[PDB]
Write a protein that binds this DNA or RNA. Sequence first.
RNA 1: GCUAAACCUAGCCCCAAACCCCACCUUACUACCAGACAACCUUAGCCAAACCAUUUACCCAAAUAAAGUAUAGGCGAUAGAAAUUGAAAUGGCGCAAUAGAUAUAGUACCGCAAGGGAAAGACAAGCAUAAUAUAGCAAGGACUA
RNA 2: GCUACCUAAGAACAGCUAAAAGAGCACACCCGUCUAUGUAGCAAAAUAGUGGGAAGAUUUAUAGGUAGAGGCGACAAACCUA
RNA 3: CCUCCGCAUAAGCCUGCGUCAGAUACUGACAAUUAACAGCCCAAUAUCUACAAUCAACCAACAAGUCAUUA
Lengths: 45, 117, 199, 26, 176, 97, 47, 41, 139
Amino acid sequence: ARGNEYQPSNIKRKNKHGWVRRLSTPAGVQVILRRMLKGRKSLSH
Amino acid sequence: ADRMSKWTSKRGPRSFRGRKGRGAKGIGFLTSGWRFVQIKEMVPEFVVPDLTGFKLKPYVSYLAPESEETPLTAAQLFSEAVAPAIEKDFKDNLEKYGFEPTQEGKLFQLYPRNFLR
Amino acid sequence: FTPPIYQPKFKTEKEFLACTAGIFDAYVPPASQVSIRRIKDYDANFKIKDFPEKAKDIFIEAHLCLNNSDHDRLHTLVTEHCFPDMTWDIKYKTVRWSFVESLEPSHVVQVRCNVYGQITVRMHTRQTLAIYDRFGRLMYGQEDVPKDVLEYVVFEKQLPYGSWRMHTKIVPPWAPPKQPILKTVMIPGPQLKPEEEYE
Amino acid sequence: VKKGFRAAFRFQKELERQRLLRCPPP
Amino acid sequence: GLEEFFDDPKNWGQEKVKSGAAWTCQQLRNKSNEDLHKLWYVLLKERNMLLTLEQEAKRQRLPMPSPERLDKVVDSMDALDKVVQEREDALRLLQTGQERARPGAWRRDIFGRIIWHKFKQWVIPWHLNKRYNRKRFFALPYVDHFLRLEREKRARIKARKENLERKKAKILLKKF
Amino acid sequence: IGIRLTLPPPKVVDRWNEKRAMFGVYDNIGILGNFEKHPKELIRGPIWLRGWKGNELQRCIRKRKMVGSRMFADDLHNLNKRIRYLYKHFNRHGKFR
Amino acid sequence: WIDGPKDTSVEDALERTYVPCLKTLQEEVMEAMGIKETRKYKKVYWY
Amino acid sequence: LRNRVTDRYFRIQEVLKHARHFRGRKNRCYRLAVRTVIRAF
Amino acid sequence: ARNVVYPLYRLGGPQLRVFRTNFFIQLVRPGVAQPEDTVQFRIPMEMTRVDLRNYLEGIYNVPVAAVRTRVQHGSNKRRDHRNVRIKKPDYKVAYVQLAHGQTFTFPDLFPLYSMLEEERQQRQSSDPRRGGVPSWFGL
RNA sequence: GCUAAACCUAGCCCCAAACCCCACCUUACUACCAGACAACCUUAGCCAAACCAUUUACCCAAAUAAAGUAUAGGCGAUAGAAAUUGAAAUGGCGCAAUAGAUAUAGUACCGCAAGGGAAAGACAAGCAUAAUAUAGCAAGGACUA
RNA sequence: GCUACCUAAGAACAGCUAAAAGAGCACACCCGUCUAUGUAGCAAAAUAGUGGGAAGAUUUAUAGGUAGAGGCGACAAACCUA
RNA sequence: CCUCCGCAUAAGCCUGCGUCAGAUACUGACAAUUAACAGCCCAAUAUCUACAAUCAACCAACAAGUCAUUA
Ligand SMILES: [Mg+2]
Ligand SMILES: [Mg+2]
Ligand SMILES: [Mg+2]
Ligand SMILES: [Mg+2]
Ligand SMILES: [Mg+2]
Ligand SMILES: [Mg+2]
Ligand SMILES: [Mg+2]
Ligand SMILES: [Mg+2]
Ligand SMILES: [Mg+2]
């Protein structure tokens, strides 16, 4: 019954975790800054 | 869920796949009814010369002498292109020698560059 | 409820030249002054009347080295074209080769010629052989009784620091058959597939 | 690798003793 | 014609094709603009033929005959491009004083980093461009801590590298 | 098996290299040089513990006091946390009162 | 060395046809090939 | 790992030698050997 | 041209001209049967079919009747020893139909050691009657 | 005799000194139309006070000393000055692949996400050779055994 | 991206009976009454049969919204990525 | 002998049983999905638009149902 909580959709993915949404708020900008500081290959989703 | 693979136009839903391109430069615009109007002037016209009788070839004979690389500079170009006329007219308004005050009005403006390659 | 813990996937995805090609001109046993000069002009010091003594010494010393598997010396004693023949089949078995007084004096036969020397020397000596196994049991030749050996040994030399090394031994078709071997041998016939019949 | 020499030398001595026991010289 | 995409039929199957030398920058600097224009397409046709050969060799699982021809042609075209670029750069410096063909500016992005923002071409002015004004060319004060942290990460990497170099040098001196 | 099977490469020590040979020189700079310099001024090391000694808490306090402004951000955060932890441990833990 | 069919002769490779001028390759080639362009490049904004 | 023990082999062998004539893993495994050697002594 | 900024065109402006084309194409053998008038090319991704038509008609004087293009995805499935995906590049494929009934077929391109060979000739394989005894010795 | 076992530098730690082409904010990495929203605002709490409720040290801009002094404080846990005084200037009794950085890498992998985050490179145990013999913490005293 | 509720704009609902129905029987579809199996399973809630609803207060795809002392809740302290 | 199965679209995934060569639907190389289907639109300013749908004709209503064009 459970386990399939991920029902993928690229529209939702980009609108929820994308670069534009991350930059849309100061908190998300700090998210990107933390990922850059850590050296993440993928900064946003 | 694939964060590492490059985002291309093959990935999203129909709207995403239609909207994203592959880097090809635009050729025209879209009107009502999604009819594409192609602008002729937007299409890169290849200026291909006539190669009949041309003597140069893709390769150079190894018998050619070696030389020292001397990258062209603004000073060298000025000396070899403007200095002779300047001297000949000084011994005897810089537009006469080639200088143009502004690039505006030219087809091939040097800055901001407005021509391909 | 406690959710299950998954171990990392990586633990379970792991997965595991100074030689020549034989003989330039093969001597056929039952006018080489040009090649004599062609070797003299490059070596500047050579004696045909004294070469057979050196050739015999080199031959005998290499055959003695084969007794103790002195491969370091054998490399310098024989050519690389000959070394696999010298030391391959003799591996993992003791050979008791020994030398006894020769029967007739050694003499040169013929010489020919980036540039590689070549000297064919005829010897008719007397030798002893005893080839054993890994386990030390005789399999070829009595160790005590000597045998008479007729050999046509061809030396090769590098033409700047190389010397005259055993290159190839010419065995004439008329040479007598070699010593018989102690153990018997089976030689299978042509193997037959299921659809094939013996004829 | 652990720094030090004494343990390694002790092990070499014990190996030599065991070798002498297994294949004593004539 | 399409035959220009392939070598001379006599060369098909030859294990090696004899080729001259790549054009050098100095050799090209003596040629006219028209001569460079024509040589560009000569080299382009040769490059297309060589790329066709390379792809067909891969398809047939065979080595490409004289693969260094492609390297020579690429070097020649790079030299020609560099020569033309040198001439254009000199002309631009003479007539405008600009060392760069494309306009740009040093700007601080939303992440506090200094970047060379290369200008783009627009039909409307920037104060009217809606998409442009969404882009932020300033860093708010919450970026300062991350700027310091990035600087210190760079400093740590540099210090590690320099210490390692000195230690390697000492090891070499002790060895010899 | 927690033992190496080979002898480690021999360690050669030059007891008479310049450092060892001149070790100790000028340790009496004060009593033999009219006390112009104190021997502790011969010590080379961290600026916050040249001619000074203390336990870990005192060392950390001194480091923060003397070079805290020059410390990297996360190093200084670690030092602050360490001072807090050491304060708690030294003033609230232990067998003795 | 023997020149192949796609190798320039040394004299051709060394011919100094370059006349130092104040013209870009583009405009020089336009003049040489006789291409005529009367339309004026409209100004654009850079930013 | 400033100071590491390098003698643990010999420390283990001192007990295992007394344990060598035991039955089962008591003659091999130090955890089991040491308990039975103490009982033996 | 590719990797260059195109000058922005406005109505009534000059024709866009490229003098030193940056596009290099490859004529490739089709992997499937194609009509005799169809030629297959591998193309830079930034090249449109109009660009290809002009390119072939100007640099090669090939009368082009039709051009179709498709972006072939390159496999991202292969992984190196570090388990990192290796991306085979995507590439554009053009199908060019020649004009005036002209026909094209991909041409049939591709239509010490001496000492080793002579030693292999002179191997002198051991005879079965020799029973592993080295035959080099003359005794 | 298998499995194994071992190795030494890949690097790292602490100091010192020194101040360190093109694309991409739209669905980022997307050549090319009407902007205008544009930022600022006491940390709290864990914890100590053996509960807890006031209270309970925290980059300071010269170390030392004054001094844990004056002071503060459910005057209790604890907190705590200043006046004044005036320090000079490329190395390791660090680690050596479970250590030293998490690091071969912020990769693989895990998570929707924020995040989390590895491993590794150069005769131990387990078995086999060789299953087992009444009775028992498996040993000890022994015994020719 | 589950789930709860909501917003925008969609879609599905055989056949018979009945006649404009929160109607009847019963497919698709939704659910989960009872039994059995399964219980490291096919499954971190499944299977088989049985059963309830099945033109509605229905089911459902897409996009959006409400965020932690908060949300949402036909209140089970239910649900808000096992 | 068996199946509310199958084929397509959507969504998702991203080359994941095509060929060849080495291994025991794995590895490597080579190839491939071609626009008419679908997506990617609209030059604006104003001003316009009460009259459901349910075979839309009768009958049947209430829960009152985007249809946006023209100068
Ligand atoms: Mg859903
Ligand atoms: Mg298409
Ligand atoms: Mg308390
Ligand atoms: Mg480690
Ligand atoms: Mg064992
Ligand atoms: Mg019905
Ligand atoms: Mg009903
Ligand atoms: Mg409800
Ligand atoms: Mg209740």
